[PDB]
């Protein structure tokens, strides 16, 4: 059997009602577990048998559903409820839903950093793109070198939601060799985020 969860990401205000959907392909399920997982910790059982609360769990959490579709609901979101949620059927888990605290949409400030002269000495050149203070989390970064699309030679990392202003920041690192770095001229990262009307490109000439 396979479990599919929705939404992949969930953006809600505190005190709001929240509903998470889990669907089962086989179509004959009477037993379903839900879990909460916070960053850096083990999962915690919330619901089992679809609608039954684990001891010590707040009344705001309820589960329902029969057959194919099951739901996990929070009556009034508490700031302590902000985390990743998993449903389960036997050995199978849903992909997980990340409850995220919503803030009005903010476009990324985009910055780009050339490789340091010092790094070139090492024999490897790193290009860095910064996506600063944005919301929602979903963001697409594309690397272009002399307008040529890069793939698989970049890695990115994202901060947790900022506790003050609830934005995210993203760092993308494009990794090249010194020689390859010097065989080309124009370096650019292209940022797509729904807060931006069209993609913003930050670039520099070597």
């Amino acid at each position: 059997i396979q479990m599919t969860q929705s939404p992949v990401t969930l953006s809600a205000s505190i005190g709001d009602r929240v509903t998470i959907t889990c669907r089962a392909s086989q179509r004959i399920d009477n037993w379903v577990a839900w879990y909460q997982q916070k960053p850096g910790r083990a999962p915690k059982l919330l619901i089992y048998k679809a609608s039954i609360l684990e001891t010590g769990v707040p009344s705001r959490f309820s589960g329902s559903g029969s057959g194919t579709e099951f739901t996990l609901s929070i009556n009034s979101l508490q700031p302590d409820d902000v985390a990743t949620y998993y449903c389960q059927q036997f050995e199978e888990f849903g992909r997980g839903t990340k409850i995220d605290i919503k803030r009005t949409v903010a476009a990324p400030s985009v910055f780009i950093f050339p490789p340091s002269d010092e790094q070139l000495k090492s024999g490897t050149a790193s290009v860095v793109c910064l996506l600063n203070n944005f919301y929602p989390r979903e963001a697409k970064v594309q690397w272009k070198v002399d307008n040529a699309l890069q793939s698989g030679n970049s890695q990115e990392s994202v901060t947790e939601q900022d506790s003050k202003d609830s934005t995210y920041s993203l760092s993308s690192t494009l990794t090249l060799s010194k020689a390859d770095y010097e065989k080309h001229k124009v370096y650019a990262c292209e940022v797509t985020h729904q807060g931006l009307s069209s993609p913003v490109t930050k670039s520099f000439n070597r």
Partner: protein
């Protein structure tokens, strides 16, 4: 209270094997199955198998058969899962699990988790490179600058700015594990561009595992 306590984080070199233990307390060890679950970095949960404490009976998913082995010491109420022929993608958090519910083996109580890192690397201090502020890194009257903390092993490193005087606008990103087996991360801060002329920015990188400390001045 039902508790599962697993061993500490392990470091292995590709091709080696790892043995993970799970200490059970608070319930009758023989009564319920022990499962093992792994979580890839920034990824979902994956079931690895279950074991019957009573006789050592075992069930494994198709993917892990011949790479996983589950055993058990009844006299000390401790479970084992051994993983062999480790690959870079075996780097994950492993959880031993048991089911609290009677007559059902799928509602889980989780162990604190065991991170297993598969790398050929040996402990190594980081290289620290400046991310210089420039015309490229300036928007409005705001500039961005930072540090590249590259090729260190293992986690963690700590990064501060001007010995802790500068905290607002600072972002230290989660480390990424590269294909080399070394970690890399960056730490940035946004500042008024007007201050680039007078205020000096220093990043302080401390990597205790190799006793490596580095202060790097970031200039335009």
């Amino acid at each position: 209270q039902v508790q599962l306590v697993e061993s500490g984080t392990q470091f292995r070199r590709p091709g080696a094997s790892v043995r993970l233990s799970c200490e059970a307390s608070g319930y009758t060890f023989i009564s319920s199955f022990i499962h093992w679950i792994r979580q890839g970095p920034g990824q979902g949960l994956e079931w690895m198998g279950w074991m019957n404490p009573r006789h050592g009976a075992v069930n494994y998913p198709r993917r892990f058969q011949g790479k996983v082995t589950m055993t058990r010491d009844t006299s000390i109420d401790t479970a084992y899962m051994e993983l062999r022929d480790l690959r870079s993608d075996d780097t994950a958090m492993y959880f031993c699990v048991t089911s609290r519910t009677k007559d059902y083996d799928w509602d889980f109580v989780w162990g604190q988790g065991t991170l297993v890192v598969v790398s050929s690397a040996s402990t190594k201090g980081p290289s620290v490179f400046p991310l210089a502020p420039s015309s490229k890194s300036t928007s409005g009257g705001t500039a961005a600058l930072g540090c590249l903390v590259k090729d260190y092993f293992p986690e963690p490193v700590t990064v501060s700015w001007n010995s802790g005087a500068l905290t607002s606008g600072v972002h230290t990103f989660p480390a990424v594990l590269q294909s080399s087996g070394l970690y890399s991360l960056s730490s940035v801060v946004t500042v008024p561009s007007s201050s680039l002329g007078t205020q000096t920015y220093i990043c302080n990188v401390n990597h205790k595992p190799s006793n490596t400390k580095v202060d790097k001045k970031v200039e335009p």
